Design a protein around this ligand. Sequence first.
Ligand SMILES: O=C(Nc1cccc(-c2nn[nH]n2)c1)c1cc(C(F)(F)F)cc2[nH]cnc12
Ligand SMILES: O=C(Nc1cccc(-c2nn[nH]n2)c1)c1cc(C(F)(F)F)cc2[nH]cnc12
Length: 263
Amino acid sequence: QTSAVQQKLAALEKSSGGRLGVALIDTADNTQVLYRGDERFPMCSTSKVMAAAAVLKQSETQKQLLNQPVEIKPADLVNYNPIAEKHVNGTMTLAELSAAALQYSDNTAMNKLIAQLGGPGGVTAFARAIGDETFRLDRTEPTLNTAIPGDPRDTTTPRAMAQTLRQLTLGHALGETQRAQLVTWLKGNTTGAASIRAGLPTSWTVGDKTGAGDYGTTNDIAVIWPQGRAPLVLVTYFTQPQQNAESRRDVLASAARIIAEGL
Ligand SMILES: O=C(Nc1cccc(-c2nn[nH]n2)c1)c1cc(C(F)(F)F)cc2[nH]cnc12
Ligand SMILES: O=C(Nc1cccc(-c2nn[nH]n2)c1)c1cc(C(F)(F)F)cc2[nH]cnc12
């Protein structure tokens, strides 16, 4: 069937000229609302959540791992490194790298997380370990954001990512202290006010991770604590036909508004 919410998401998508993917899980009843929920989309920096979570999982058996220093060299800087560039010729701890990747979207920090896991395939291996058979990370930063239509590299589906984000932030994929740390990091994101959050009532609490890439790819994944109800998990992915297309965070806000209105 096609629901009223799905029809509105299709109208939004048509007006936008692009391709929109949405997955909601309402933990009040475990129900799901999906739009293109099983189509693949480039994750871009939303993949930083899986990398940080994989390091958190490693830290469950190494109490000092998050305090471990990682050298930052001039050659490690890539295209967007607002935190890491302050530490060139010095070090950052794995906690600092996780916070920078998640809250500032630092690409050098992400590359250090990937390297700690043995490469992109180590991130994929963690996804499989927590029951996500769909996620794949194939490249490092910045090339994982090429976002080429039809390219399976560095993609997932909205359904899979919503399920994984629920397990990581509200479920038991991580230990309790690690889950709390991930939630704290997401709630402190600096980059999210124009994306999912912009479509939701201001009283609601949001933790999210944004992403963007070529093909005007504009993404956000969020855990949401609405006023007076159980938490929601919402993924909004958007990509466009031309390589140079402009970002469209407003489309993500509009999708979130349609979802909220449909609860
Ligand atoms: O850093 C960014 N973009 C960037 C930097 C360097 C190079 C290129 C690029 N390379 N080839 N095409 N574009 C792109 C960026 C950062 C952020 C952030 F994290 F919120 F600050 C949001 C964004 N939305 C679209 N782009 C961004
Ligand atoms: O790295 C990139 N973008 C970036 C970096 C850091 C943070 C964010 C971001 N975080 N939350 N929203 N956007 C985005 C990027 C890379 C590439 C390329 F060609 F693959 F290298 C093309 C791009 N077109 C627009 N952005 C890009």
